[PDB]
RNA sequence: AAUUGAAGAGUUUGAUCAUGGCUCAGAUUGAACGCUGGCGGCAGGCCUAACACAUGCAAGUCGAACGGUAACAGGAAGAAGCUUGCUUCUUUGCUGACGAGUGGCGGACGGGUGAGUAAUGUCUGGGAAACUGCCUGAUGGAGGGGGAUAACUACUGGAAACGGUAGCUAAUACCGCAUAACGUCGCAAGACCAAAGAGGGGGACCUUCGGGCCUCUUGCCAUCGGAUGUGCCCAGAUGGGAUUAGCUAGUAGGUGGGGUAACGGCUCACCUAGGCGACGAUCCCUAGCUGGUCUGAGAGGAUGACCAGCCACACUGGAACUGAGACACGGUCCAGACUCCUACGGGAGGCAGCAGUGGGGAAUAUUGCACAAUGGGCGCAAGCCUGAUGCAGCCAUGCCGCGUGUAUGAAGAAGGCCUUCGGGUUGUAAAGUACUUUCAGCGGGGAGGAAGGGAGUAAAGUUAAUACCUUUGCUCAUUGACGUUACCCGCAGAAGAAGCACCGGCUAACUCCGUGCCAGCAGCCGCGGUAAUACGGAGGGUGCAAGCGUUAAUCGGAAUUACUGGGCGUAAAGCGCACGCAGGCGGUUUGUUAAGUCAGAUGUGAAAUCCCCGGGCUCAACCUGGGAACUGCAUCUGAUACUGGCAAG
């Protein structure tokens, strides 16, 4: 959803209390990866061979504004 | 101490060697006393291949440098005994 | 420093982050240097087909 | 790497059959030589001292099907390599493996020569090069290799080729579609109008 | 830190604290032997100058003075202890 | 033979110390002019042998002092 | 054969010539950005914050120095569940081996960075008062004793870091004693100085049966050499500033003491009153130096990434200790700034080593593989360690290769564009039709970097020995990280692979439309106010091509700081006028000198780079043998016209 690829590097999983490292990650898992450059919320991560955009979730909408000046 | 060994020149994947005088010290493609001849393990079977001033060798040989195993192998087999 | 924002139109306002190129503008004495199309916060110029390079305008989908 | 556009467009800039289509017939017409390389083409526009000496190695390059950087390196070596650096421009350019086999007659064109060349279809001494690039040497022998060896090409290229102006310093053969790099070609022994001191004229400025 | 060969450290400090001794005694005897030149006494400064050869020697060779330090202490120690005594 | 040194004395007043003065012609690196470049060592003579003006000879030779390692040789005229 | 190569253009004017600045064509880059992007080879990659750092790694190794047993393994001063020669338990350090400890060597190399340093350094050429681990040559020594202490054991404090008391023990740890010259002091006479043992095997003779003993291999001490390394000294060169002119108390010299490996105001006491500076001291600013790099016809100008030499630094200031070597990058001590841990009493740490994060920025990469090779540490060796190194990953950052097809194809299709409505163009371009299949993909097959080590065995090699040790043949198993390597052989099908700037002059490339001093372009002149080749779109063309432009930057053109190679009547430029110290310059003859100057010879001018000629990777890039070159420096020997010094005219 942004035309660009990313190269995975180093993983990691939250677990329970401890970065703990990974260098696989199956389906039906969670994690996060670290070092990715321009991954924003709501893009698909696919195989650059079968590539798939998914649904993507929505975004709420914001219901209050205010203007702010730097002190 | 001073020896004789190989200091890689070549470039990434065809090295080649350049026999060299020097204090154990220095580094390897770094500071040395004196050029002494060259090893080219690849050079194909063509005319040259491997040098040495072997009266050169023999002479720091003289005053108690040391020598490479390898450089070892390259002298007994250029021979100088028969 | 004061610079030339070239091409038919422009978002850039009070608060835009630019990257600022060097070039004057002989008209503008003063002005001494060129804010880049496409760069940052100034977006390309619309509907530019010719000399897209400049002016941060991309190739329009073969 | 390579141009692959519209040849003939490129002989009639130049004014000039460059047997970019050599292949059979024609040898220029069936595409109007000159009288228009654009929608303005059928103008004389009087062109300047820098013109004719861009044109003139315009088309030298366009002639070996050679582009900017390889021309210019080649334009290096001359000047550096003692001799006259306008002639042996020349004799690099006509040195390239590519080159040769299509002197030889392995080639219709000189395009076609390079696609042999390529697709590792031409040996010399024996041992297979494939750079279209190779600067061959006397004594050479650059031959087709059998495992493709007089199929319809090379078959047609040796036909016209052979009836075309056959060269000097090289010997071929068509049985064994073998030739011997006698020699570098001397400068007399190419040419047509075609001029040097412009294109050496030209990268000294 | 974290370098085990850190036991360099312990070590020589053993090796400070017994140099401090040695070195510290070699020391206090050769002033015996300038003191006996402050006092004049010609017999206790060629006294003194054979109890201390033997220690300014010895500890050249444990290697704690070097040599030529030797030397010159006796070398000029002498060069007094005979030029008014 | 000996890497000696002519140059005339200046100063004299430092008891065993005399300061010589060496000039010298050498072409100026970028213009050509064959300009003077004088030299200045502080010299050791040994019982005050020379004296201000004096020419001398000398040679270069282990540390004596702050700037002092040359003695003399010979003295070659003297008076004023 | 080998530093044999010098280009101009636009722009002041109505026009001209000159003057003079601005501007342009080139080459180059550790680049960045915009649009675009197929592969490969070689190389390069934090230029800013010497900003702060999470995490892991970057320095260990020897049991053949020692006491030793925590774990492994074996054997057992020998034992069950029975699964009687095949297991898993307890012992015994017996042997292999090995955590912790003593000890030895290494941690001063390797690697990083440029902060400081304008001369405490670097460069070139010389010099004398010096030390120098391991390696090496020679000569002898290697005798005989003593006191300890870690570990350990027993109490015992901490959350942790760390320990605390008492007692015990080994050695190549430690200290006496002997021995004492070709060593040190000394004119001599004389005084005085050291050390260590350990392994493999073994005939007898033998003993507490531990080994004595014999042998081979190592290690220990001393002295003198060699080698390498390092310290010290001198001259010359190595940035800018006078809107910095004076500077200097250990200051300059001396004497004598002390001190260092060594010379020395290095230090100290006294005496002299010196020392430095207009040839730029002093004080400011900036800065690592060099080989070289870039440019240039050259002289020059610019520059010091990557490679190699030298120096300096290691969170900031400071200090020493250990040591052959440090005033120590992953050591100690003090202090400071800062961060982290704590059970609040107390602790710990310093990536400018590799990778990596944040930050800063226009911008600079993987928390990878391996010791297979080269090399470094320890080791007799096997081996262990090695973010040095060898490879890979990332990025078109550069260079060099290759591809994205090759032929064929006309009344010249459609469509677009211009059209004097005839046609012209895009354009053999497309389609169509034959052909090839590099490189990507798939399947096969397979070099080179691998030399060595290890077992066996045969050799007047030893030796008391047919052991041990050593060497050399031969023999037998075996040693790649890269690696799905290079490269070759098959398979299918044009199949998966083209952008970017420009087209008014400079400048290669011209039209329609829109627009109407608007919107905009623009390196320089300059375009735009209704027929714009200058703006924007299109058609067409031109140049480049996996890159193309823009920006930034250095040199060039720029003879526009003019040594080479310029000017000052009016263009910028002669001080309003003189006097005159320093400086520069100096008539004419001879003698003398030989500094300048010229000649020769001998040293050195690291390798790499540039160049020449060869050789190797399919070519090229790249790698490489030899040569030329390094136009310099120093020294010795000559020359004596000219210049200078001196003499006399
Ligand atoms: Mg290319
Ligand atoms: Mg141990
Ligand atoms: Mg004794
Ligand atoms: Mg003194
Ligand atoms: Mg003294
Ligand atoms: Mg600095
Ligand atoms: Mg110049
Ligand atoms: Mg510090
Ligand atoms: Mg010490
Ligand atoms: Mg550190
Ligand atoms: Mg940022
Ligand atoms: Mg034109
Ligand atoms: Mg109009
Ligand atoms: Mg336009
Ligand atoms: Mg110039
Ligand atoms: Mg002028
Ligand atoms: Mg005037
Ligand atoms: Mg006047
Ligand atoms: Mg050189
Ligand atoms: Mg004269």
Same mark, same amino acid.
Request: hydrophobic share 35%; charged share 35%; proline share 4%.
């Given at each position: 959803v942004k035309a660009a690829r990313e190269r995975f590097?180093?993983?990691?999983?939250?677990?329970?209390?401890?970065?703990?490292?990974?260098?696989?990650?199956?389906?039906?898992?969670?994690?996060?990866?670290?070092?990715?450059?321009?991954?924003?919320?709501?893009?698909?991560?696919?195989?650059?061979?079968?590539?798939?955009?998914?649904?993507?979730?929505?975004? $709420?909408? $914001?219901?209050?504004?205010?203007?702010?000046? $730097?002190? | 101490m001073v020896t004789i060994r190989l200091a890689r020149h070549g470039a990434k994947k065809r090295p080649f060697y350049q026999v060299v005088v020097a204090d154990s010290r220095n /580094?390897?493609?770094?500071?040395?006393?004196?050029?002494?001849?060259?090893?080219?393990?690849? /050079?194909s079977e063509k005319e040259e291949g491997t040098r040495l001033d072997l009266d050169r060798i023999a002479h720091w040989v003289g005053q108690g440098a040391t020598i490479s195993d390898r450089v070892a192998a390259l002298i007994k087999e250029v021979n100088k005994a028969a | 420093?004061?610079?030339?924002?070239?091409?038919?139109?422009?978002?850039?306002?009070?608060?835009?982050?630019?990257?600022?190129r060097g070039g004057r503008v002989k008209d503008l004495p003063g002005v001494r240097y060129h804010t880049v199309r496409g760069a940052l916060d100034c977006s390309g110029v619309k509907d530019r087909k010719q000399a897209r390079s400049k002016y941060g305008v991309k190739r329009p989908k073969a | 790497a390579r141009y692959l556009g519209p040849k003939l467009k490129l002989s009639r800039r130049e004014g000039t059959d460059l047997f970019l289509k050599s292949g059979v017939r024609a040898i220029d017409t069936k595409c109007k030589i000159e009288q228009a390389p654009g929608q303005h083409?059928?103008?004389?526009?009087?062109?300047?001292? %820098?013109?004719?000496?861009?044109?003139?190695?315009?088309?030298?390059?366009?002639? %070996?099907?050679?582009? =900017?950087?390889? &021309?210019?390196? %080649?334009?290096?070596?001359?000047?550096?390599? *003692?001799?006259?650096?306008?002639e042996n421009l020349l004799a690099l350019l006509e040195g390239r493996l590519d080159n040769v086999v299509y002197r030889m007659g392995f080639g219709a064109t000189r395009a076609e020569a390079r696609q042999l060349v390529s697709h590792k279809a031409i040996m010399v001494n024996g041992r297979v090069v494939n750079i279209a690039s190779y600067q061959v040497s006397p004594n050479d022998v650059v031959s087709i290799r059998e495992?493709?060896?007089?199929?319809?090409?090379?078959?047609?290229?040796?036909?016209?080729?052979?009836?075309? =102006? *056959?060269?000097?310093?090289? =010997?071929?053969?068509?049985?064994?579609?073998?030739?011997? &790099?006698?020699?570098?070609?001397?400068?007399?022994?190419?040419?047509?109008?075609?001029?040097?001191?412009?294109?050496?004229?030209?990268?000294?400025? | 830190n974290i370098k085990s060969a850190k036991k360099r450290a312990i070590q020589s400090?053993?090796?400070?604290?017994?140099? !401090?001794?040695?070195?510290?005694?070699?020391?206090?005897?050769?002033?015996?032997?300038? !003191?006996?030149?402050?006092?004049?006494?010609? !017999?206790?400064?060629?006294? !003194?100058?054979?109890?201390?050869?033997?220690?300014?020697?010895?500890?050249?060779?444990?290697?704690?003075?070097?040599?030529?330090?030797?030397?010159?202490?006796?070398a000029n120690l002498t060069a007094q202890i005979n030029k008014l005594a | 033979?000996?890497?000696?040194?002519?140059?005339?004395?200046?100063?004299?007043?430092?008891?065993?110390?005399?300061?010589?003065?060496?000039?010298? @012609?050498?072409?100026?690196?970028?213009? +050509?002019? @064959?300009?003077?470049?004088?030299?200045?060592?502080?010299?050791?003579?040994?019982?005050?042998?020379? +004296?201000?003006?004096?020419?001398?000879?000398?040679?270069?030779?282990?540390?004596?002092?702050? #700037?002092?390692?040359? #003695?003399?040789?010979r003295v070659v005229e003297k008076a004023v």
């Open positions: 590097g180093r993983i990691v999983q939250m677990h329970a209390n401890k970065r703990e490292e990974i260098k696989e990650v199956r389906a039906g898992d969670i994690a996060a990866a670290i070092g990715l450059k321009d991954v924003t919320t709501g893009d698909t991560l696919c195989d650059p061979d079968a590539p798939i955009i998914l649904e993507r979730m929505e975004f $709420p909408e $914001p219901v209050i504004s205010i203007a702010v000046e $730097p002190k | /580094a390897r493609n770094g500071r040395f006393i004196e050029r002494v001849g060259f090893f080219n393990p690849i /050079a | 420093v004061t610079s030339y924002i070239g091409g038919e139109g422009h978002n850039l306002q009070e608060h835009s982050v630019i990257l600022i | 083409g059928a103008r004389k526009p009087r062109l300047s001292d %820098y013109g004719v000496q861009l044109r003139e190695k315009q088309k030298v390059r366009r002639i %070996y099907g050679v582009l =900017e950087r390889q &021309f210019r390196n %080649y334009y290096k070596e001359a000047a550096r390599l *003692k001799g006259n650096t306008g495992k493709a060896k007089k199929q319809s090409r090379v078959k047609a290229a040796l036909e016209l080729a052979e009836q075309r =102006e *056959k060269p000097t310093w090289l =010997e071929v053969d068509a049985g064994k579609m073998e030739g011997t &790099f006698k020699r570098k070609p001397e400068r007399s022994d190419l040419s047509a109008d075609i001029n040097e001191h412009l294109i050496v004229e030209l990268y000294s400025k | 400090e053993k090796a400070r604290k017994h140099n !401090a001794s040695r070195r510290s005694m070699m020391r206090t005897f050769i002033k015996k032997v300038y !003191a006996a030149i402050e006092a004049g006494d010609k !017999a206790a400064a060629q006294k !003194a100058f054979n109890e201390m050869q033997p220690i300014v020697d010895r500890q050249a060779a444990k290697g704690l003075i070097h040599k030529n330090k030797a030397a010159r202490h006796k | 033979k000996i890497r000696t040194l002519q140059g005339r004395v200046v100063s004299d007043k430092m008891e065993k110390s005399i300061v010589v003065a060496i000039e010298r @012609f050498v072409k100026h690196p970028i213009y +050509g002019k @064959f300009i003077k470049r004088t030299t200045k060592l502080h010299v050791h003579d040994e019982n005050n042998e020379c +004296g201000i003006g004096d020419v001398v000879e000398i040679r270069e030779c282990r540390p004596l002092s702050k #700037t002092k390692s040359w #003695t003399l040789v």
